[model samples]
Target: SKITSILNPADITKALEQCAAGFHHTAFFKASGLSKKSDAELAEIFNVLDGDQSGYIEVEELKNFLKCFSDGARVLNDKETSNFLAAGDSDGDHKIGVDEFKSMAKMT
Candidate 1:
């Protein structure tokens, strides 16, 4: 079997909307205002979340994706992780590049 299966992570639009709204209520948005963060601030965050230094955020990186943003941010469950990926992985690579994370971060 040379083929590989990809998880679709459906509801891209809906999940993204939830991410926008959901994040807004969190300190990352309410306190710091993710959309208004300076370029340096945003860049720093991308580096923080890209834990493996892979230049892209793989699923494992998501364990602290939110945790990177705030003190009490919880680790993402499988569903939360997949839904978040739906928005960040729009390029369909099943991983989020810095570009994807930055744009998605500004959604709120």
Candidate 2:
């Protein structure tokens, strides 16, 4: 079974923190219950995350998204930012395209 399936609601935030520490962006999203979403559902999320609607998610975009989770407590460290990019920037272009985001979300 998926980790999300068994996760308690009270532990969601903590689990997300742990996933972020390991640079597990996809895992973080999965544990957020996104893994159960359909492609169309995830597309909306991708669009929102894209921010500028530029067809790609830049490092700063991702950073901003992470900041929401931090609640001004802390920001993503340099290593966390780098690893987050590395996880989805498969083409080595330093950005995540819509397709890449979908792939990371296991929607493809």
Candidate 3:
């Protein structure tokens, strides 16, 4: 849609899913259908986003996301962590799995 400073959890997760959904151009949806992306590039984002390297954006990492970064951007409260999980944890694995992350990186 538009631009937003990721000072909050909502914007962080929203930006991520939007990127994977192939909205990186405008920098923001779900309509993308299928294609391949550069593994190196996609992997780059995931690993950095993975923080603790648990292989995905697990709750704890996500919970303390802001602090984890040297920036210590901002902390995410309980309910605030709500929406991000739904957006990234698409396969019901309860978190942002790498495979799903790549799948999300796919587009038509």
After superposition on all CA atoms, what RMSD does each candidate show versus the true structure? 12.6, 5.5, 9.0
If the candidates were sorted by their lDDT against the true structure, best first, what order would they fall in?
A: 2, 1, 3
Candidate 1's C-alpha runs over 4 A off are 1-32, 70-73
Clashes of each: 0, 0, 2
Model 1, span 12-108: residue lDDT tens = 2233345554542233433345555555666676776676799988988875565554345557677767777786777999998877777776763
lDDT digits (tens) for residues 53-90 of candidate 3 = 88888887766544433344455666655555655677
Give the whole-model CA lDDT for all candidates, comma-separated.
Answer: 0.58, 0.66, 0.52
- Provide the clash count, candidate 1: 0
**Which candidate do you rate higher for lDDT, 2 or 3?**
2
TM-score of 3: 0.51
lDDT of 2 at 89: 82
Clashing residue pairs in candidate 3 (N, C-alpha, C atoms within 3 angstroms): 34-107, 34-108
Q: After superposition, how far is residue 86 of candidate 1 from its true place, in Å?
A: 0.5
The C-alpha TM-scores of every prediction are 0.62, 0.70, 0.51
Q: Write the per-residue lDDT of candidate 2 for residues 1-108, one digit (tens) a residue.
A: 122333344455764566544646666666666566667766776776676889888888776655434445355667777877887787889998877777777742
